[PDB]
Amino acid sequence: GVQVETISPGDGRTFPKRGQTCVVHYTGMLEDGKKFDSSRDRNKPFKFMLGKQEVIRGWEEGVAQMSVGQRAKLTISPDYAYGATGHPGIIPPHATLVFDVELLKLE
Amino acid sequence: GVQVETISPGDGRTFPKRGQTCVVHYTGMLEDGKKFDSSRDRNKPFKFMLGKQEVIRGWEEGVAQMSVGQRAKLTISPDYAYGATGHPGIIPPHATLVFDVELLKLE
Numbered sequence: 001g002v003q004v005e006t007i008s009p010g011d012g013r014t015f016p017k018r019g020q021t022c023v024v025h026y027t028g029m030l031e032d033g034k035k036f037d038s039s040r041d042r043n044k045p046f047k048f049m050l051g052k053q054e055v056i057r058g059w060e061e062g063v064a065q066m067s068v069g070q071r072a073k074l075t076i077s078p079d080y081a082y083g084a085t086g087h088p089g090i091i092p093p094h095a096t097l098v099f100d101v102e103l104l105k106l107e
Numbered sequence: 108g109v110q111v112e113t114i115s116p117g118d119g120r121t122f123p124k125r126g127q128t129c130v131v132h133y134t135g136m137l138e139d140g141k142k143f144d145s146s147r148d149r150n151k152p153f154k155f156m157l158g159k160q161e162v163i164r165g166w167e168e169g170v171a172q173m174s175v176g177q178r179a180k181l182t183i184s185p186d187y188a189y190g191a192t193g194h195p196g197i198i199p200p201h202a203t204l205v206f207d208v209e210l211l212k213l214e
């Protein structure tokens with residue numbers, strides 16, 4: 001499933017609803033610790049519509065429990081992520097992913 | 108594909124290579140003129156590495172044709188951008204994108 005561990009608390013009142021645009025900064029790491037991606041490195045937040053954007057299950061469930069301003073670590077089992085195939089050229093088969101996510105704003 | 112039209116020239120000899128980080132300022136518009144994003148509004152340059160599979164095809168092939176210091180208009184057909192899916196709620200399905208880009212430096 002996904003495990004959420006808070007690094008910094010958010011406001012505790014404003015949680016993402018379906019149809020809202022979540023603006024996040026994330027760093028993705030494999031369970032071993034190799035960073036494979038980061039929006040923070042591109043200097044550009046990832047914006048997606050919760051419910052409309054096709055994302056791995058762990059991300060959808062994990063961000064849904066975060067309130068605005070929270071920074072959390074989501075550890076996602078491969079069945080909640082890219083499973084058995086992985087994502088060619090970026091995620092290996094059967095990988096557990098660790099995401100450091102900050103929910104910056106809901107539009 | 109990507110059409111690159113010069114607004115102001117670069118040095119004419121330092122072109123991005125695979126494995127280098129392009130640092131750019133840009134504004135992105137849908138072809139009807141609607142602005143959907145800009146690094147200037149975040150006041151941080153956008154950075155991405157060539158070959159790292161982290162930007163749409165139109166960025167990699169467009170910037171590969173620019174020299175440092177160049178400012179250019181890039182027109183990107185949907186098949187070199189978000190295609191038939193778009194980026195729900197930001198980029199519509201089958202959108203041609205127009206970017207005003209300045210390649211500031213390579214690192």
Ligand SMILES: CO[C@H]1C[C@@H](C)C/C(C)=C/[C@@H](CCOC(=O)NCc2ccccc2)C(=O)C[C@H](O)[C@@H](C)[C@@H](/C(C)=C/[C@@H]2CC[C@@H](O)[C@H](OC)C2)OC(=O)[C@@H]2CCCCN2C(=O)C(=O)[C@]2(O)O[C@H]1[C@@H](OC)C[C@H]2C
Nearest residue numbers: 028037046054055056059081082087090161186188189190
């Ligand atoms: C640098 O790009 C990142 C993603 C966005 C920040 C950028 C973006 C909008 C990319 C589009 C592709 C833009 O490219 C185009 O639209 N190209 C258009 C085109 C294609 C072909 C022909 C013509 C035109 C995309 O893939 C959207 C997708 O929703 C992302 C956010 C999502 C993924 C990869 C979901 C997959 C989707 C497929 C499912 O099967 C799978 O199930 C396991 C889940 O990604 C995710 O679900 C998770 C959670 C959010 C962050 C992204 N993410 C990651 O796992 C990553 O960290 C990752 O590294 O993030 C990049 C992804 O690149 C595809 C790959 C992916 C491993």
